[PDB]
Design a protein around this ligand. Structure first.
Ligand code: HEC
Length: 114
């Protein structure tokens, strides 16, 4: 949860993500508190879109486990909601971050991206 230390982790996210514009991935400014699959102008996968449609809002707490394994997180979310059939595909985000402290720091960084 050290946002300054999260800057260095955020350099990897900048391959695909900017704060205000879409690129390979959606724009991330305001992502903490945003309904999944809704950055204006971004075309999301069905797995991410259906997760937000089922109510998923990204928070400082749930982005941490998400970053360890995006597919697993989103599948488990829709399964828990009784919507396992909507989680058969995969996300466009092919990156994963294993280290828990790095995930917590980068999420503290994201929370400052207003
Ligand atoms: C390119 C290889 C990426 C890397 C590096 C990072 N992300 Fe990503 N992210 C990528 C895509 C293509 C998408 C769209 C996913 C889909 O299935 O449509 C995403 C999505 C996210 C999200 C969800 C955003 C939303 O629902 O609006 C988050 C919270 C996210 N990505 C965070 C994130 C972080 C913090 C990264 C660095 C640690 C990171 N991503 C790397 C592509 C890529």
């Amino acid at each position: 949860q050290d946002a300054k230390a999260g800057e260095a982790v955020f350099k990897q996210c900048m391959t695909c993500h900017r704060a205000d514009k879409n690129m390979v991935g959606p724009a991330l400014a305001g992502v903490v508190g945003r309904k999944a699959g809704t950055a204006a102008g971004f075309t999301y996968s069905p797995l991410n879109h259906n997760s937000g449609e089922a109510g998923l809002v990204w928070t400082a707490d749930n982005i941490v486990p998400y970053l360890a394994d995006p597919n697993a997180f989103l599948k488990k979310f829709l399964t828990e909601k009784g919507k396992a059939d909507q989680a058969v595909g995969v996300t466009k985000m092919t990156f994963k971050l294993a280290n828990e402290q790095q995930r917590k720091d980068v999420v503290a960084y994201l929370a400052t991206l207003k």
